[PDB]
């Protein structure tokens, strides 16, 4: 069996590829996501101006999961940009962008930049509303009317298809407002849910002492921790967002996790700390793995399944 | 060495007690909890009316936590009240009692009645903010607004010392807030950092399901899934609240995740699904357990470690 999709215009082997920030922040870092066996890759995150981050240790990993406050480490969108202008293999898989401007009008001077390499290249959009590791800049998703305002402005300056990076809702009434703002905008096509669960706190037993320096310990989760909260956010916007597509990141270590996000809704699966711990290997077992237990359902297509998750009654 | 507290004019032979809704729903479930070694025991939230809760399957449980969508089965508020007021024996250890009405003005009926209770029994009350599991009603404490109306009527109708328990936030931004809301109300002398982790979605991969009937399977996440969201939320109000109380919940299995509670700033320490799972045998070895790492370390009280959780730098 082979795992095909044809998404936003262009053709995936499969529908694995890295989070944004994992393995993505250099031109070494991205020449290797390429020539892994995801099906597409995302650039780190970008700011106008390249930053040197938080101070470390800003990351840290666990059984169960990791806890990160990076605070944007990247090379500067020029970088980027002129990767994805000059550097990038498409033959080999599509490429993502993903921007975090610490500002609406920083988001805007890069989207209207970015368009005219959108338009000649193909290069895909993921504007990350939901930062939660920059000093003072809270997650723009979580205030709607932020979220509104960022949407507008990057919508009328970009003029293209892009697509949305989630953080994770805990209420009912917050899918309900969040996916409503989303699809007052028609350009767009694709909602990555979710990134990290914002501010949790890891503490060492043995040394008392908080486990990352910035924010006084306090980072965004990954891992096995956020499995069933990324699940809930994927299937909450796949069912409040029916004419756009998710992408469905949080808590992936196998074929079976992959199974999951997609029976929630999931049409691609970012696959973010189990990438960081396990290298780049991880996609030909995480493929592996899924068509297993698509072979042993009786499944032939992602199609057959996506979305199917049963409710009981 | 020595587990002892004494607060909110009371003594409590050690910190652990069950989190609410864990056993402590009938007079046999509270019989149950007085006579295990836990420090006090919680009634299960109630409502003016007894209520069935959501239909079945309505918790399960799982290696890494359990998910829930009750819906606040109670056998009504009169039936607590009565507990407080005749049955318990308060000289085997202290009594709280959560209300979890669906509006102020139930809560502000409940509270006008239990205050006479409080006054002559010394019963303590842990108002419910946070429930995340009644169709339609989403988490009081997500909206700042009804917060304060909330802990004002109450306040106002109430008189006396209480409690509040609280969502888990996951922003910056909400810890500030949400601890400034709670600054305002010099009555409210203990905060209990948290309540599940709301609106997650567990799915079985062989039967394609969700595993709960509720809410097409979203429910509140407790247990391993939730300690390092519970511990930063723990020690934001702890930091946030310094002429308060905070007590901690989320994630506790072993007199580790309790030290670690507590070096972030807990008081009490409550017990959710892993007392469910275990059943209240669990509380000598969470005593035991605990005791045994203050020996290690040469702490001789609670009050040696508690809040000294340190940062780096
Ligand atoms: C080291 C690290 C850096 C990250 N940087 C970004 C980022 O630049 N942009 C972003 O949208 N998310 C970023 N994230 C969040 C991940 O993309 C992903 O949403 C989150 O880690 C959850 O997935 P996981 O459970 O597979 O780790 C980062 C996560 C980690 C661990
Ligand atoms: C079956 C069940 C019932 C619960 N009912 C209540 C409740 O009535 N009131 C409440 O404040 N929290 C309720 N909770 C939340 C728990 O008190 C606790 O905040 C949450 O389970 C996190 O703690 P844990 O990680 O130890 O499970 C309930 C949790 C469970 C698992
Ligand atoms: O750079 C980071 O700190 C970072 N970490 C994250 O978990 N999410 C982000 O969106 C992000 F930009
Ligand atoms: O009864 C419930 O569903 C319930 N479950 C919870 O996890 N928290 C509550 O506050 C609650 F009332």
Redesign the pocket.
């Known amino acids: 069996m082979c795992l095909k999709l044809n998404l936003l215009d262009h053709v995936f082997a499969n529908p694995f590829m890295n989070a944004?920030?994992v393995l993505c922040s250099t031109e070494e870092d991205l020449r290797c996501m390429t020539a892994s066996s995801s099906g597409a890759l995302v650039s780190?995150?970008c700011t106008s101006a390249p930053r040197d981050?938080?101070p470390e240790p800003?990351y840290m990993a666990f059984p169960l999961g990791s806890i990160?406050?990076?605070?944007?480490?990247?090379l500067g969108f020029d970088f980027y940009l002129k990767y994805a202008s000059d550097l990038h293999d498409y033959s080999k898989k599509p490429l993502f962008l993903?921007i975090?401007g610490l500002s609406v009008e920083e988001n805007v001077a890069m989207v209207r930049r970015l368009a005219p390499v959108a338009q000649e290249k193909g290069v895909l959009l993921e504007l990350?509303l939901?930062?939660?590791?920059?000093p003072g800049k809270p997650q723009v998703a979580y205030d709607f009317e932020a979220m509104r305002t960022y949407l507008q402005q990057v919508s009328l300056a970009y003029g293209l298809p892009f697509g949305v990076?989630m953080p994770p809702y805990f209420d009912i009434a917050h899918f309900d407002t969040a996916a409503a703002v989303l699809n007052e905008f028609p350009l767009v096509k694709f909602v990555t849910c979710v990134?990290?669960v914002?501010n949790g706190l890891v503490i060492d037993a043995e040394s008392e002492s908080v486990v990352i320096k910035p924010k006084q310990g306090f980072?965004?989760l990954?891992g096995k921790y956020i499995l069933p909260t990324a699940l809930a956010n994927v299937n909450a916007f796949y069912r409040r967002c029916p004419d756009k597509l998710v992408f469905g990141c949080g808590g992936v270590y196998s074929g079976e996790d992959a199974f999951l996000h997609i029976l929630a809704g999931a049409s691609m699966v970012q696959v973010?700390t189990a990438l960081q711990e396990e290298g780049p290997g991880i996609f030909t077992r995480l493929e592996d793995e899924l068509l297993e237990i698509m072979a042993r359902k009786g499944y032939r297509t992602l199609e057959e399944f996506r979305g199917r998750v049963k409710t009981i009654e």
Chains 1, 2 share one sequence.
């Open positions: 944004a920030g780190k995150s981050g938080n800003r990160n406050s990076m605070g944007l480490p990247n993903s975090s990350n939901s930062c939660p590791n920059v990076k990134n990290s914002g980072g965004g990954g973010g």
